[PDB]
Amino acid sequence: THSHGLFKKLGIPGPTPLPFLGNILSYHKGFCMFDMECHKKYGKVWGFYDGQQPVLAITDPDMIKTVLVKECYSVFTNRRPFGPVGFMKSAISIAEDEEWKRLRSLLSPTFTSGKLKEMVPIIAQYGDVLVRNLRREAETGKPVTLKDVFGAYSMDVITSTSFGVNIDSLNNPQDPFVENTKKLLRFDFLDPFFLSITVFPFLIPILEVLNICVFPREVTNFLRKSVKRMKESRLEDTRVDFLQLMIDSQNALSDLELVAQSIIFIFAGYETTSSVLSFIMYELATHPDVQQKLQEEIDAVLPNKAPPTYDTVLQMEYLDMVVNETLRLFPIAMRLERVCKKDVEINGMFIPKGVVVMIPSYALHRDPKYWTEPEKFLPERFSKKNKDNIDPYIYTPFGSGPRNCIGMRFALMNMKLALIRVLQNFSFKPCKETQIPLKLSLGGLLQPEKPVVLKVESR
Numbered sequence: 001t002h003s004h005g006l007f008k009k010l011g012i013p014g015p016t017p018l019p020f021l022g023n024i025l026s027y028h029k030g031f032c033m034f035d036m037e038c039h040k041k042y043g044k045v046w047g048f049y050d051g052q053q054p055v056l057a058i059t060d061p062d063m064i065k066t067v068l069v070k071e072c073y074s075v076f077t078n079r080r081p082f083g084p085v086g087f088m089k090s091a092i093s094i095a096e097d098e099e100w101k102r103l104r105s106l107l108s109p110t111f112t113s114g115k116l117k118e119m120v121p122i123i124a125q126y127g128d129v130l131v132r133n134l135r136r137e138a139e140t141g142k143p144v145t146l147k148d149v150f151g152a153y154s155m156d157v158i159t160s161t162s163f164g165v166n167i168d169s170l171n172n173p174q175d176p177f178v179e180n181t182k183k184l185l186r187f188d189f190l191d192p193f194f195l196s197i198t199v200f201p202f203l204i205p206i207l208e209v210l211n212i213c214v215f216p217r218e219v220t221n222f223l224r225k226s227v228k229r230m231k232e233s234r235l236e237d238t239r240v241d242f243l244q245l246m247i248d249s250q251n252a253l254s255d256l257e258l259v260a261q262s263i264i265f266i267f268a269g270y271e272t273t274s275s276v277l278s279f280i281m282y283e284l285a286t287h288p289d290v291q292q293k294l295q296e297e298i299d300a301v302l303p304n305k306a307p308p309t310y311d312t313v314l315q316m317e318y319l320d321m322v323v324n325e326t327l328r329l330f331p332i333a334m335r336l337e338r339v340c341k342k343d344v345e346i347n348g349m350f351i352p353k354g355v356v357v358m359i360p361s362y363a364l365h366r367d368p369k370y371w372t373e374p375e376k377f378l379p380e381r382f383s384k385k386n387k388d389n390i391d392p393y394i395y396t397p398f399g400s401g402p403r404n405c406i407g408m409r410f411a412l413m414n415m416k417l418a419l420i421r422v423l424q425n426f427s428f429k430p431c432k433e434t435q436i437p438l439k440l441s442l443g444g445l446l447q448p449e450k451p452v453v454l455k456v457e458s459r
């Protein structure tokens, strides 16, 4: 269909596009499989079409550094525009160019060491509720869905840190704040919707006029007035945080622009954290040796079940290696993307304006070139002895350069506080409903298709 001659013309290899669809039918196997096959078939560089949209996949470490780091401001500043967003247009992750730059420098000081350290005792209050929730399900000896119990912890941790609003979500099985959230991405290729906007962009500006959204008007009004509430709470009182840093600005940030960042952070800080924690626990169970070695490290650094501190969290090398290794196998972003905003040639390759450049993270994390036994879970690959044999541009679970994950440092620590507490009280065993091996969901988000269910024993 016209734009379909580009990679032919550039002499770049790729699967042959269909009219209108592009290579969209190959997503039927899920696109991590697609990416992996493209790598195997085509080598270090290839091209494909998301409908009419050209996407150039790259895998050269240098070229990746060029686009992620060296030419971020100048050419590769923005992600793809995905679908109809409405007011979320203003969200840092979706914001383009100048708008993004000022939101970045406005919101970045949120995750500094001092500000992290001030959230340590705050989580220290929820870490303790989490253990209390598990200890009860461990009594019954009856299987646990980790997503459920982790999810609630994450929600408590995010709402309270970013805003200063303790909302008891852990002492609340029935809770409006977790439920309204998780129904924020219906993202599937079986879901006829995202398959029509992934393929079919020309729809987008119409939907913007229709005020149709990927987030049902349902969530963003609960989340609207709810944020519109903690806002006044702060405004009406006589600790300088996320919700506050934006009340620095509101004396040049506005209202829906505040709500928008809140929602991003509420989302990221709930779904990602709980998912990875699920993945990690699946790994510790299917690998007891590793589970025990980590329980040893914790008891070593934090003797007599000692409560975590910021610095002791960092002391724990093996914890970090476990966290890193899970993130190798399960990068929740499966690909990184930047839209090429002007003609360019990087490392001896021409790239035309408008192309989406894509880093296939999930694929590179499993590449036989860089990783021996790339399917095996092996934390030792992240030991100080082997740590630098590892290319920071092949291993990118957090992205890289200026548009990398603003929430990385908080995420690592948030996750690590949860683990420490959890493993210093319980051990995790494979039961019957456990899926071995675990398989991934084909649709959008890198998820387990069956939830992660394990047996929990006290110590």
Ligand SMILES: CC(C)c1nc(CN(C)C(=O)N[C@H](C(=O)N[C@H](CC[C@H](Cc2ccccc2)NC(=O)OCc2cnco2)Cc2ccccc2)C(C)C)cs1
Pocket: 050, 079, 080, 081, 082, 088, 093, 094, 184, 185, 197, 198, 215, 263, 264, 267, 268, 272, 333, 334, 335, 336, 337, 405, 407, 444
């Ligand atoms: C075929 C094409 C359309 C696609 N490409 C992909 C791969 N990909 C980059 C995605 O993950 N999907 C994209 C997507 O939703 N990503 C987002 C777009 C913004 C959305 C906004 C949003 C999400 C949920 C509820 C409400 C709002 N996501 C978002 O901001 O994620 C927060 C996060 C930070 N760190 C981890 O997670 C950008 C992003 C990507 C990876 C990591 C972090 C942020 C879209 C292109 C659909 C899936 S479909």
Ligand code: HEM
Pocket: 092, 093, 094, 104, 264, 265, 266, 268, 269, 272, 273, 276, 331, 332, 333, 336, 337, 396, 397, 398, 399, 400, 402, 403, 404, 405, 406, 407, 408, 410, 411, 412
């Ligand atoms: C373990 C959980 C998490 C993982 C694996 C993760 C991974 C990522 C990745 C890979 C990106 C894209 C970076 C790039 O494209 O180069 C990203 C972007 C981002 N993440 Fe994180 N993330 C996690 C948790 C968080 C948390 C807790 C927050 C903050 C609440 C967060 C906020 C963001 C924002 C705002 C962006 C867009 C950055 C920008 O455009 O300036 N994510 N996340």
